[PDB]
């Protein structure tokens, strides 16, 4: 239920990363120290936390 908004685009570098653009909204599933794990359009993957701000 925690939502984050992308501040800059991020392109996946592994098969378990998310892709997204500036202003895309990501549901945050888990948070580590550098990377978060989230969901967009039913796809789940990792992305760096520095790329998003919480809504």
């Amino acid at each position: 239920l925690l939502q984050a908004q992308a501040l800059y685009p991020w392109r996946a570098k592994k098969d378990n990363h998310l892709n997204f653009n500036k202003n895309d909204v990501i549901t945050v599933l888990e948070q580590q120290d550098m990377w978060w794990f989230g969901e967009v359009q039913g796809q789940k993957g990792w992305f760096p936390k520095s790329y998003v701000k919480l809504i």
């Binding site: 098969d15 378990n16 580590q32």
Partner: peptide, 12 residues
């Protein structure tokens, strides 16, 4: 997804 490959493997 907690036991999923994509989660368990981590980001690196």
């Amino acid at each position: 997804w907690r036991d999923s490959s994509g989660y368990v493997m981590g980001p690196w």
